[PDB]
Design a protein around this nucleic acid. Sequence first.
RNA 1: GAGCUAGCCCUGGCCAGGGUGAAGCUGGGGUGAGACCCAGUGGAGGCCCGAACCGGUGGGGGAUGCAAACCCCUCGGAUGA
RNA 2: GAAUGCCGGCAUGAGUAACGAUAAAGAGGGUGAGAAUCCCUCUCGCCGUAAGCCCAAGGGUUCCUACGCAAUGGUCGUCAGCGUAGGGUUAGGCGGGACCUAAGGUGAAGCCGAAAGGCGUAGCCGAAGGGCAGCCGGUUAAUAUUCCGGCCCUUCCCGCAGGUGCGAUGGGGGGACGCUCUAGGCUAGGGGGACCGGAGCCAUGGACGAGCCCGGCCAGAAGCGCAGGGUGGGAGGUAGGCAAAUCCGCCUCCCAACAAGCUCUGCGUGGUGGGGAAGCCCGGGUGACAACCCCCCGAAGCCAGGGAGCCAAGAAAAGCCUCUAAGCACAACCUGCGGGAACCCGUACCGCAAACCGACACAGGUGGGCGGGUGCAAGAGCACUCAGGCGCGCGGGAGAACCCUCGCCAAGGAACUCUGCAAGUUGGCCCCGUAACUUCGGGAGAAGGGGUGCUCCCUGGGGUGAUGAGCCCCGGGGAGCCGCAGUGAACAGGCUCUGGCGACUGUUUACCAAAAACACAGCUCUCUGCGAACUCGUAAGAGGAGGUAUAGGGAGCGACGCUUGCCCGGUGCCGGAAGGUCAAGGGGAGGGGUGCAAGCCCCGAACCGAAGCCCCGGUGAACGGCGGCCGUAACUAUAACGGUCCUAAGGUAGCGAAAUUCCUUGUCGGGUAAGUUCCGACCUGCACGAAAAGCGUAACGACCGGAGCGCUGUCUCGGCGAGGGACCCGGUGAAAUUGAACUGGCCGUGAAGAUGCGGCCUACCCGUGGCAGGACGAAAAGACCCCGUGGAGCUUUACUGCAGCC
RNA 3: CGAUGUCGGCUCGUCGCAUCCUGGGGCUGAAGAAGGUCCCAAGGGUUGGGCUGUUCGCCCAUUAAAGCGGCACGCGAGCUG
RNA 4: UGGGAGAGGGUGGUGGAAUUCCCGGAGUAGCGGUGAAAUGCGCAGAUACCGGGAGGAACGCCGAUGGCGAAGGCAGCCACCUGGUCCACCCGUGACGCUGAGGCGCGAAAGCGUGGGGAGCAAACCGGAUUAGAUACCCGGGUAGUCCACGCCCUAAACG
RNA 5: CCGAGGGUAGGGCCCGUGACUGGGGCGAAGUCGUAACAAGGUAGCUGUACCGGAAGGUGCGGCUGGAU
Lengths: 48, 275
Amino acid sequence: MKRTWQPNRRKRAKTHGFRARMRTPGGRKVLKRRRQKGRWRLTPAVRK
Amino acid sequence: AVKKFKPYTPSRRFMTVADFSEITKTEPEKSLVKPLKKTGGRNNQGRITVRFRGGGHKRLYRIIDFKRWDKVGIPAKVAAIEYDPNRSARIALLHYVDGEKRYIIAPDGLQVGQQVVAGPDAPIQVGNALPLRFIPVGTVVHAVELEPKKGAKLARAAGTSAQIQGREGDYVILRLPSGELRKVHGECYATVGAVGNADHKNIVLGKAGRSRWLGRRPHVRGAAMNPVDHPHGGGEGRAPRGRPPASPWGWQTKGLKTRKRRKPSSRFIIARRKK
RNA sequence: GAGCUAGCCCUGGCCAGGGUGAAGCUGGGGUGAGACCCAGUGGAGGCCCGAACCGGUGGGGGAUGCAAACCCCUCGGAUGA
RNA sequence: GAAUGCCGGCAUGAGUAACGAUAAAGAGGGUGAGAAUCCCUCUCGCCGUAAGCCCAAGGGUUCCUACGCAAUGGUCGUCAGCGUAGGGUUAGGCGGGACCUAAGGUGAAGCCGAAAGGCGUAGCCGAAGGGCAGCCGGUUAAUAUUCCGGCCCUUCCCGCAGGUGCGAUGGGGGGACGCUCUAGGCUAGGGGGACCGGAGCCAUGGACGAGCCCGGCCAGAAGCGCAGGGUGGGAGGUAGGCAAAUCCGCCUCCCAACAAGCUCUGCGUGGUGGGGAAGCCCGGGUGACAACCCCCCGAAGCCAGGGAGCCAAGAAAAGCCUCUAAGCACAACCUGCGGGAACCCGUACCGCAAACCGACACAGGUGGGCGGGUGCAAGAGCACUCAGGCGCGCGGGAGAACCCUCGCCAAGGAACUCUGCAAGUUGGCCCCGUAACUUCGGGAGAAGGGGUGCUCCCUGGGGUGAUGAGCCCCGGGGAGCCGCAGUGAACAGGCUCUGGCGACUGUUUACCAAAAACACAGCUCUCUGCGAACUCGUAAGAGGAGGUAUAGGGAGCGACGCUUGCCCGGUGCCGGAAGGUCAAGGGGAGGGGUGCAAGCCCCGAACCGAAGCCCCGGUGAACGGCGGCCGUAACUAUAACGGUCCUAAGGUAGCGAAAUUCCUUGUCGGGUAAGUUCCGACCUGCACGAAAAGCGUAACGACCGGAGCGCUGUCUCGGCGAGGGACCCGGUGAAAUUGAACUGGCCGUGAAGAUGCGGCCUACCCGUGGCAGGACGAAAAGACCCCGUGGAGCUUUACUGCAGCC
RNA sequence: CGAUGUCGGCUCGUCGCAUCCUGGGGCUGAAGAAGGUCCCAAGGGUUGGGCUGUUCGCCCAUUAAAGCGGCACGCGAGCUG
RNA sequence: UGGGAGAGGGUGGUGGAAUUCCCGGAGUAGCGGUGAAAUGCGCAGAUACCGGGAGGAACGCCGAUGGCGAAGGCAGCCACCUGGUCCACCCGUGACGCUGAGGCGCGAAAGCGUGGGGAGCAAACCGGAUUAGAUACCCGGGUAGUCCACGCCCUAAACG
RNA sequence: CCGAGGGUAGGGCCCGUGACUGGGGCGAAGUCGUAACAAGGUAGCUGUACCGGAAGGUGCGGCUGGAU
Ligand SMILES: CCC[C@H]1[C@H](O)[C@@H](N)[C@@H](O[C@H]2[C@H](O[C@@H]3O[C@H](CO)[C@@H](O[C@H]4O[C@@H](CN)[C@@H](O)[C@H](O)[C@H]4N)[C@H]3O)[C@@H](O)[C@H](N)C[C@@H]2N)O[C@@H]1CO
Ligand SMILES: [Mg+2]
Ligand SMILES: [Mg+2]
Ligand SMILES: [Mg+2]
Ligand SMILES: [Mg+2]
Ligand SMILES: [Mg+2]
Ligand SMILES: [Mg+2]
Ligand SMILES: [Mg+2]
Ligand SMILES: [Mg+2]
Ligand SMILES: [Mg+2]
Ligand SMILES: [Mg+2]
Ligand SMILES: [Mg+2]
Ligand SMILES: [Mg+2]
Ligand SMILES: [Mg+2]
Ligand SMILES: [Mg+2]
Ligand SMILES: [Mg+2]
Ligand SMILES: [Mg+2]
Ligand SMILES: [Mg+2]
Ligand SMILES: [Mg+2]
Ligand SMILES: [Mg+2]
Ligand SMILES: [Mg+2]
Ligand SMILES: [Mg+2]
Ligand SMILES: [Mg+2]
Ligand SMILES: [Mg+2]
Ligand SMILES: [Mg+2]
Ligand SMILES: [Mg+2]
Ligand SMILES: [Mg+2]
Ligand SMILES: [Mg+2]
Ligand SMILES: [Mg+2]
Ligand SMILES: [Mg+2]
Ligand SMILES: [Mg+2]
Ligand SMILES: [Mg+2]
Ligand SMILES: [Mg+2]
Ligand SMILES: [Mg+2]
Ligand SMILES: [Mg+2]
Ligand SMILES: [Mg+2]
Ligand SMILES: [Mg+2]
Ligand SMILES: [Mg+2]
Ligand SMILES: [Mg+2]
Ligand SMILES: [Mg+2]
Ligand SMILES: [Mg+2]
Ligand SMILES: [Mg+2]
Ligand SMILES: [Mg+2]
Ligand SMILES: [Mg+2]
Ligand SMILES: [Mg+2]
Ligand SMILES: [Mg+2]
Ligand SMILES: [Mg+2]
Ligand SMILES: [Mg+2]
Ligand SMILES: [Mg+2]
Ligand SMILES: [Mg+2]
Ligand SMILES: [Mg+2]
Ligand SMILES: [Mg+2]
Ligand SMILES: [Mg+2]
Ligand SMILES: [Mg+2]
Ligand SMILES: [Mg+2]
Ligand SMILES: [Mg+2]
Ligand SMILES: [Mg+2]
Ligand SMILES: [Mg+2]
Ligand SMILES: [Mg+2]
Ligand SMILES: [Mg+2]
Ligand SMILES: [Mg+2]
Ligand SMILES: [Mg+2]
Ligand SMILES: [Mg+2]
Ligand SMILES: [Mg+2]
Ligand SMILES: [Mg+2]
Ligand SMILES: [Mg+2]
Ligand SMILES: [Mg+2]
Ligand SMILES: [Mg+2]
Ligand SMILES: [Mg+2]
Ligand SMILES: [Mg+2]
Ligand SMILES: [Mg+2]
Ligand SMILES: [Mg+2]
Ligand SMILES: [Mg+2]
Ligand SMILES: [Mg+2]
Ligand SMILES: [Mg+2]
Ligand SMILES: [Mg+2]
Ligand SMILES: [Mg+2]
Ligand SMILES: [Mg+2]
Ligand SMILES: [Mg+2]
Ligand SMILES: [Mg+2]
Ligand SMILES: [Mg+2]
Ligand SMILES: [Mg+2]
Ligand SMILES: [Mg+2]
Ligand SMILES: [Mg+2]
Ligand SMILES: [Mg+2]
Ligand SMILES: [Mg+2]
Ligand SMILES: [Mg+2]
Ligand SMILES: [Mg+2]
Ligand SMILES: [Mg+2]
Ligand SMILES: [Mg+2]
Ligand SMILES: [Mg+2]
Ligand SMILES: [Mg+2]
Ligand SMILES: [Mg+2]
Ligand SMILES: [Mg+2]
Ligand SMILES: [Mg+2]
Ligand SMILES: [Mg+2]
Ligand SMILES: [Mg+2]
Ligand SMILES: [Mg+2]
Ligand SMILES: [Mg+2]
Ligand SMILES: [Mg+2]
Ligand SMILES: [Mg+2]
Ligand SMILES: [Mg+2]
Ligand SMILES: [Mg+2]
Ligand SMILES: [Mg+2]
Ligand SMILES: [Mg+2]
Ligand SMILES: [Mg+2]
Ligand SMILES: [Mg+2]
Ligand SMILES: [Mg+2]
Ligand SMILES: [Mg+2]
Ligand SMILES: [Mg+2]
Ligand SMILES: [Mg+2]
Ligand SMILES: [Mg+2]
Ligand SMILES: [Mg+2]
Ligand SMILES: [Mg+2]
Ligand SMILES: [Mg+2]
Ligand SMILES: [Mg+2]
Ligand SMILES: [Mg+2]
Ligand SMILES: [Mg+2]
Ligand SMILES: [Mg+2]
Ligand SMILES: [Mg+2]
Ligand SMILES: [Mg+2]
Ligand SMILES: [Mg+2]
Ligand SMILES: [Mg+2]
Ligand SMILES: [Mg+2]
Ligand SMILES: [Mg+2]
Ligand SMILES: [Mg+2]
Ligand SMILES: [Mg+2]
Ligand SMILES: [Mg+2]
Ligand SMILES: [Mg+2]
Ligand SMILES: [Mg+2]
Ligand SMILES: [Mg+2]
Ligand SMILES: [Mg+2]
Ligand SMILES: [Mg+2]
Ligand SMILES: [Mg+2]
Ligand SMILES: [Mg+2]
Ligand SMILES: [Mg+2]
Ligand SMILES: [Mg+2]
Ligand SMILES: [Mg+2]
Ligand SMILES: [Mg+2]
Ligand SMILES: [Mg+2]
Ligand SMILES: [Mg+2]
Ligand SMILES: [Mg+2]
Ligand SMILES: [Mg+2]
Ligand SMILES: [Mg+2]
Ligand SMILES: [Mg+2]
Ligand SMILES: [Mg+2]
Ligand SMILES: [Mg+2]
Ligand SMILES: [Mg+2]
Ligand SMILES: [Mg+2]
Ligand SMILES: [Mg+2]
Ligand SMILES: [Mg+2]
Ligand SMILES: [Mg+2]
Ligand SMILES: [Mg+2]
Ligand SMILES: [Mg+2]
Ligand SMILES: [Mg+2]
Ligand SMILES: [Mg+2]
Ligand SMILES: [Mg+2]
Ligand SMILES: [Mg+2]
Ligand SMILES: [Mg+2]
Ligand SMILES: [Mg+2]
Ligand SMILES: [Mg+2]
Ligand SMILES: [Mg+2]
Ligand SMILES: [Mg+2]
Ligand SMILES: [Mg+2]
Ligand SMILES: [Mg+2]
Ligand SMILES: [Mg+2]
Ligand SMILES: [Mg+2]
Ligand SMILES: [Mg+2]
Ligand SMILES: [Mg+2]
Ligand SMILES: [Mg+2]
Ligand SMILES: [Mg+2]
Ligand SMILES: [Mg+2]
Ligand SMILES: [Mg+2]
Ligand SMILES: [Mg+2]
Ligand SMILES: [Mg+2]
Ligand SMILES: [Mg+2]
Ligand SMILES: [Mg+2]
Ligand SMILES: [Mg+2]
Ligand SMILES: [Mg+2]
Ligand SMILES: [Mg+2]
Ligand SMILES: [Mg+2]
Ligand SMILES: [Mg+2]
Ligand SMILES: [Mg+2]
Ligand SMILES: [Mg+2]
Ligand SMILES: [Mg+2]
Ligand SMILES: [Mg+2]
Ligand SMILES: [Mg+2]
Ligand SMILES: [Mg+2]
Ligand SMILES: [Mg+2]
Ligand SMILES: [Mg+2]
Ligand SMILES: [Mg+2]
Ligand SMILES: [Mg+2]
Ligand SMILES: [Mg+2]
Ligand SMILES: [Mg+2]
Ligand SMILES: [Mg+2]
Ligand SMILES: [Mg+2]
Ligand SMILES: [Mg+2]
Ligand SMILES: [Mg+2]
Ligand SMILES: [Mg+2]
Ligand SMILES: [Mg+2]
Ligand SMILES: [Mg+2]
Ligand SMILES: [Mg+2]
Ligand SMILES: [Mg+2]
Ligand SMILES: [Mg+2]
Ligand SMILES: [Mg+2]
Ligand SMILES: [Mg+2]
Ligand SMILES: [Mg+2]
Ligand SMILES: [Mg+2]
Ligand SMILES: [Mg+2]
Ligand SMILES: [Mg+2]
Ligand SMILES: [Mg+2]
Ligand SMILES: [Mg+2]
Ligand SMILES: [Mg+2]
Ligand SMILES: [Mg+2]
Ligand SMILES: [Mg+2]
Ligand SMILES: [Mg+2]
Ligand SMILES: [Mg+2]
Ligand SMILES: [Mg+2]
Ligand SMILES: [Mg+2]
Ligand SMILES: [Mg+2]
Ligand SMILES: [Mg+2]
Ligand SMILES: [Mg+2]
Ligand SMILES: [Mg+2]
Ligand SMILES: [Mg+2]
Ligand SMILES: [Mg+2]
Ligand SMILES: [Mg+2]
Ligand SMILES: [Mg+2]
Ligand SMILES: [Mg+2]
Ligand SMILES: [Mg+2]
Ligand SMILES: [Mg+2]
Ligand SMILES: [Mg+2]
Ligand SMILES: [Mg+2]
Ligand SMILES: [Mg+2]
Ligand SMILES: [Mg+2]
Ligand SMILES: [Mg+2]
Ligand SMILES: [Mg+2]
Ligand SMILES: [Mg+2]
Ligand SMILES: [Mg+2]
Ligand SMILES: [Mg+2]
């Protein structure tokens, strides 16, 4: 049946993207934490 | 007035519709309509703050002239009478003899191709506007400003009216559509005549669908919910209210007055409503 | 976290084909004028059959499954909330 | 050495289940170390409103070619969406951007918030909406509206000519709109041809024919032609469109009006450019100078912003046109012609799936367009089939039990069973006919029947064309023929009578409940006079509503019909300027401490003093409540009647062994051979009752009862048959579980249910197919129950607090 | 209680005997026939239906008779629900 | 043809008296009601009095033994619209008449539907009395209804 | 072809009958009250509405077939 993952590039970049994170305090702290943990990529890869 | 239907469906036997016989134009003045943002009962936060709203027919908003004192002395012809889906009343298209085009809510008896005017020296005629101080005592009136130059606020709905009862200083005494006796400033404008389309209350929606057409979503009783949702929620099987009947928000909903006690307009309310 | 689900907003799309034959309109009859009646036209409807589509009634299977809700037979609705 | 320990390794079940739709395979010839599985051919089956084609998401080299077979592929593998390498995606016109707005997002101004931040007009962003200029064909192993060919067009820049008051983020018009039904004319598409072109073909008994087979077109600028859309002309005045305005609006007058004219589309034709089958032969060559014609059907698409009706009343902005402002009129704009200029991104391939979402090459999920033919009334239904695409990535045998899906059945015909569960029956169309009841629509497909094929003859009207032929669409009558049977195959109601519940269409527990539940029109009560009430928010601010009491919130009830009785004593709510209590505060009689004293400091009575509570009334479609005992009539029996205790008042109408009745299968009647259910009555109603509505109610129902008819494999009572499994052989090869095991029965005993202890009996060692009685079999640290001074949701006149309100 | 699935039905039996029937008996208030009661006996048999979830029970029509119990109120890794 | 009387009917408007209520004033110990009482109302200031305002219904005198209408029925006043009738003149038509089964229309009150309205009155209901009882007559309350519009009802001691 | 009739199916009319239920007529001396006839102790009758153990009562309009 219809599953929970229904990918959508506009949705992905507008919800979890870099610009979405920087806009709010919690989003910036995510980036801070991911950048501190050494995450190779700070944000989901969506090919646009 | 009020068209009935033969019972050829379950819903038809009760459904009734307006006679529409006073309407003369079936499309609005493009110069006086603007798009109407449907809210669905949600606010700037996104939250439902008025329950059970959404999903009705799309509408255009006709700009209506509640001032009418911005064109004192300039008479106008009643060009057409039209449907307005934003209100219970019908609206009347005005062509002013100086070119301007406006809408007013159509009083009862108003006919197409007649002169109307606003001002202290206007005749006492169905459709004319005056300050309340210049209207004879005892004449029905509608579209009444509650404060001078602030806009017509009272007696707007189809069939409503307000009778002038007396004068006292700068203030006239109005019997509002609800029966309240109130003082309204004499400088406030008002339009002689009751609002038209009085058979608007004899309309029978006939089925659930028509309510949905009007943007009214299904209302669900507190007695049908659960204690998390409503004071009347829960019970095994059915259940009487088991407490003073309350709203979803706890406050009692049978008889409990809610008008603010110290509201400054109370100095002008002569008698609370009848019945 | 509303890319699932729920409601709402905006903007688009879809609903084969066949039944039934509301109002009105017309002519005719009727009467003081009416109500009204007959035929025709007309094509209304949370109207009927039935796909697409939306569902999920009963039964059988499946039960370390094809599937962490599926398969078969049957069945609700399908111009409307 | 144990923690259902943790990590890892390896076992057991086991050569076991399975190897993923039962649409299906066979042979020949290839290649290769190796072939059921790759390639080629022939034969067979399967999809064909798809299982074919084209888009969009999403995926991201999976596309093409070469070379491979370790792993991946449920077997195999020489193959591959796998490994390696090389190649491949071309646009001013397709799509998006350099254009426009929608919800929404953001947001100079402004507002608000401890901080972070929240709002917010303009403006900006935001598209599958608006707007904007490319069609036919060819070419590559792989791209093509992109390369190429043919014919077209758009914008920018500059120039030349002609014309004009030119000029805009400013005014206006326009853009610009719903639902249902729908006219005319076209086109897409399809059908037919005894006409036109074609390599051929004559079989097997006949046919050399008006034979079979194949094909009979696509695009196209100007002009013209047919069909539409849009559109009055001119003048005079003018206070309005936030400056102006010659525009727009308003007013008057003249002329044109269903034309015409202008303007714009569609279709046709159109210079020219393409395409071009079967068959045969090695994707190509031929066919072939291919032919490219007539008739019919005909869109839901086109003309279109067409027409009609209806109420629920149907985006915006830009492009565009017009008007004028500063300014400028050597300019500028428009028009025509010319040259020059025209950027960024996507383009491969999959795309109902082996490439997307489901851990899998997973029987599931996934929006748009095209979706041929014949017949069955129609259709996207159903059967077959075209183009095209597949035979579902384990096979070969065998012909047991048993399971699944399916076929049939003598006599019986619900006797099955909780229940006709299931499966029969019925089944489309035409016609005949059709009950109670009814809200007059319905009930109604009521029920019940008849017809249905094929041939010949006679005939009625319609469309097209021309009125005729032709095609084509509805019929009418008469005579016949055949079979068991003519909607001959496929798709296609079983029916009725009587209850309960709910009026109804709808809605719901995604994944055990679709209902009597929720909703619903409708009724009532109640709040709300607008900076409304109410809701969210600390606020600003929103929603309510750009609404105004015929409106908006809350509550119960739930179409409609007839109705909704008595109690205000308690609780709530409403009203009550008296009275009583009542906090801070006011007041300061009167004391206290300290100092030599002025003074400083502390306590503090009367009295004044809100809301709230007390108190007085009201109020039921407010929360709620609506009795007991004794006696009595000239047979008995029963009490119309009386007595008395209590209450705030003692249940009214109507219903009643009921979705309600404990005793209970109450009693009587009906139905049945027999009826704890059912229906109708009765009334000592454990414990109905009137908007948590009472009693009815036509219509409706995948709701829950009872009865009958029809018909049956449900059953007496089973039998046989089909296929897919189970079984045997080759290939691949799991799982839970598992203290170790050399693991019998009885009667005992044992912590009370022993393979394991005693006694006795019985028993050669090891398998395979089967059945489930045991191993207190597996699974889940019982979901019942208790326990924990364990937790969570809920309630309230439990405690205490907080918001909110006063 | 780190689970011994709980009623009834269906299927499949097996055992006990305090015996419903069939066989053998003694007593009888046994004339016969048919009964009553007790003794022996477990070999075999012990029906089809209406009602109810029912076990039971009542009822219909039969019968030689329409027995009573145990087997985890026998039997859900056998089915039903 | 010319006249006359009339609460004949329908529509819109309108005038004063009275009752209830509300606001202000003034005043205080009761008012109200009956056969007598009580319920009820009143120091929370009632009743009685004055002024003001709201609202409904009914129209005193004239008024009569009266008038009109087919009956039911119709009463402040003004205007509009309309019916019937009587009289005079003796002008016109020339039996065109009487009745009337069916039909159709009208039809007091009460009642019914949808709206509106609501002062007074008042079924039902409540209370106080009376009484053996009092589901009555009497008293205090009191809802439908009484009123308006529209749509049904179609009955009567619709009687002379 | 028609055809007695037989059969399946659905209607109409009448008659008999039915648990129970509705009143009605009638039947010397049962019970409760006393509505009517006199102003019958509230004048009566009345159409209707609602109520009440029962006669009745009450509202609304109507009649005198009402005394004084
Ligand atoms: C032996 C039989 C005697 C009987 C009588 O013949 C009956 N008439 C009856 O008499 C009763 C009488 O009963 C009435 O008489 C009638 C029955 O016969 C009935 O009254 C009704 O008679 C109707 C006419 N037949 C009507 O007038 C109305 O309904 C009543 N008046 C009964 O209720 C009763 O009123 C008296 N007070 C007492 C009297 N003994 O009952 C008596 C039994 O004892
Ligand atoms: Mg889902
Ligand atoms: Mg999605
Ligand atoms: Mg996207
Ligand atoms: Mg998105
Ligand atoms: Mg973002
Ligand atoms: Mg990572
Ligand atoms: Mg790195
Ligand atoms: Mg991130
Ligand atoms: Mg109607
Ligand atoms: Mg009707
Ligand atoms: Mg109107
Ligand atoms: Mg606009
Ligand atoms: Mg809004
Ligand atoms: Mg916002
Ligand atoms: Mg709300
Ligand atoms: Mg809402
Ligand atoms: Mg309104
Ligand atoms: Mg309107
Ligand atoms: Mg004012
Ligand atoms: Mg209504
Ligand atoms: Mg609406
Ligand atoms: Mg509502
Ligand atoms: Mg509700
Ligand atoms: Mg509930
Ligand atoms: Mg609930
Ligand atoms: Mg919640
Ligand atoms: Mg609560
Ligand atoms: Mg409750
Ligand atoms: Mg409940
Ligand atoms: Mg309950
Ligand atoms: Mg409930
Ligand atoms: Mg309660
Ligand atoms: Mg409460
Ligand atoms: Mg509040
Ligand atoms: Mg008020
Ligand atoms: Mg979603
Ligand atoms: Mg749409
Ligand atoms: Mg449809
Ligand atoms: Mg017709
Ligand atoms: Mg018409
Ligand atoms: Mg429908
Ligand atoms: Mg039908
Ligand atoms: Mg339907
Ligand atoms: Mg079934
Ligand atoms: Mg299974
Ligand atoms: Mg499962
Ligand atoms: Mg399925
Ligand atoms: Mg099916
Ligand atoms: Mg349809
Ligand atoms: Mg140890
Ligand atoms: Mg261990
Ligand atoms: Mg552990
Ligand atoms: Mg471990
Ligand atoms: Mg481990
Ligand atoms: Mg491990
Ligand atoms: Mg290791
Ligand atoms: Mg291992
Ligand atoms: Mg081992
Ligand atoms: Mg092994
Ligand atoms: Mg083996
Ligand atoms: Mg095994
Ligand atoms: Mg397996
Ligand atoms: Mg498997
Ligand atoms: Mg499998
Ligand atoms: Mg299949
Ligand atoms: Mg199959
Ligand atoms: Mg072969
Ligand atoms: Mg082969
Ligand atoms: Mg090789
Ligand atoms: Mg091979
Ligand atoms: Mg090989
Ligand atoms: Mg091959
Ligand atoms: Mg061959
Ligand atoms: Mg096809
Ligand atoms: Mg997208
Ligand atoms: Mg992937
Ligand atoms: Mg390999
Ligand atoms: Mg290999
Ligand atoms: Mg190999
Ligand atoms: Mg290698
Ligand atoms: Mg592999
Ligand atoms: Mg696989
Ligand atoms: Mg090009
Ligand atoms: Mg640029
Ligand atoms: Mg911060
Ligand atoms: Mg944009
Ligand atoms: Mg766009
Ligand atoms: Mg474009
Ligand atoms: Mg082109
Ligand atoms: Mg210009
Ligand atoms: Mg411009
Ligand atoms: Mg427009
Ligand atoms: Mg518009
Ligand atoms: Mg549009
Ligand atoms: Mg509509
Ligand atoms: Mg074309
Ligand atoms: Mg065709
Ligand atoms: Mg001007
Ligand atoms: Mg050639
Ligand atoms: Mg289409
Ligand atoms: Mg169009
Ligand atoms: Mg149109
Ligand atoms: Mg905008
Ligand atoms: Mg110059
Ligand atoms: Mg120009
Ligand atoms: Mg650029
Ligand atoms: Mg490409
Ligand atoms: Mg699919
Ligand atoms: Mg694929
Ligand atoms: Mg997933
Ligand atoms: Mg999965
Ligand atoms: Mg596969
Ligand atoms: Mg074809
Ligand atoms: Mg068909
Ligand atoms: Mg098909
Ligand atoms: Mg296969
Ligand atoms: Mg075998
Ligand atoms: Mg056979
Ligand atoms: Mg048989
Ligand atoms: Mg039978
Ligand atoms: Mg039979
Ligand atoms: Mg049965
Ligand atoms: Mg059986
Ligand atoms: Mg069939
Ligand atoms: Mg019948
Ligand atoms: Mg009938
Ligand atoms: Mg009925
Ligand atoms: Mg009828
Ligand atoms: Mg039939
Ligand atoms: Mg025939
Ligand atoms: Mg034949
Ligand atoms: Mg059917
Ligand atoms: Mg029936
Ligand atoms: Mg329900
Ligand atoms: Mg329902
Ligand atoms: Mg009901
Ligand atoms: Mg109902
Ligand atoms: Mg309902
Ligand atoms: Mg429906
Ligand atoms: Mg569920
Ligand atoms: Mg659940
Ligand atoms: Mg779940
Ligand atoms: Mg289920
Ligand atoms: Mg359902
Ligand atoms: Mg529900
Ligand atoms: Mg309902
Ligand atoms: Mg109702
Ligand atoms: Mg109401
Ligand atoms: Mg709040
Ligand atoms: Mg607003
Ligand atoms: Mg309810
Ligand atoms: Mg009825
Ligand atoms: Mg009370
Ligand atoms: Mg009280
Ligand atoms: Mg109270
Ligand atoms: Mg005092
Ligand atoms: Mg106080
Ligand atoms: Mg209580
Ligand atoms: Mg109580
Ligand atoms: Mg009653
Ligand atoms: Mg009973
Ligand atoms: Mg019972
Ligand atoms: Mg019973
Ligand atoms: Mg009942
Ligand atoms: Mg009960
Ligand atoms: Mg019972
Ligand atoms: Mg019984
Ligand atoms: Mg009894
Ligand atoms: Mg209640
Ligand atoms: Mg209640
Ligand atoms: Mg239903
Ligand atoms: Mg249902
Ligand atoms: Mg039956
Ligand atoms: Mg069988
Ligand atoms: Mg077989
Ligand atoms: Mg062998
Ligand atoms: Mg062998
Ligand atoms: Mg092997
Ligand atoms: Mg392998
Ligand atoms: Mg061991
Ligand atoms: Mg061992
Ligand atoms: Mg052994
Ligand atoms: Mg023991
Ligand atoms: Mg033992
Ligand atoms: Mg042993
Ligand atoms: Mg041992
Ligand atoms: Mg020992
Ligand atoms: Mg031993
Ligand atoms: Mg032994
Ligand atoms: Mg073997
Ligand atoms: Mg075995
Ligand atoms: Mg076993
Ligand atoms: Mg066992
Ligand atoms: Mg154990
Ligand atoms: Mg165990
Ligand atoms: Mg076991
Ligand atoms: Mg066990
Ligand atoms: Mg489990
Ligand atoms: Mg644990
Ligand atoms: Mg535990
Ligand atoms: Mg435990
Ligand atoms: Mg557990
Ligand atoms: Mg316990
Ligand atoms: Mg404790
Ligand atoms: Mg303790
Ligand atoms: Mg605790
Ligand atoms: Mg919690
Ligand atoms: Mg807690
Ligand atoms: Mg706090
Ligand atoms: Mg246990
Ligand atoms: Mg365990
Ligand atoms: Mg266990
Ligand atoms: Mg003897
Ligand atoms: Mg003996
Ligand atoms: Mg024996
Ligand atoms: Mg029993
Ligand atoms: Mg036993
Ligand atoms: Mg046991
Ligand atoms: Mg036991
Ligand atoms: Mg027991
Ligand atoms: Mg089981
Ligand atoms: Mg069991
Ligand atoms: Mg077992
Ligand atoms: Mg078994
Ligand atoms: Mg006093
Ligand atoms: Mg008033
Ligand atoms: Mg004469
Ligand atoms: Mg009154
Ligand atoms: Mg009393
Ligand atoms: Mg009358
Ligand atoms: Mg015969
Ligand atoms: Mg006596
Ligand atoms: Mg006697
Ligand atoms: Mg009397
Ligand atoms: Mg008397
Ligand atoms: Mg008396
Ligand atoms: Mg009397
Ligand atoms: Mg009374």
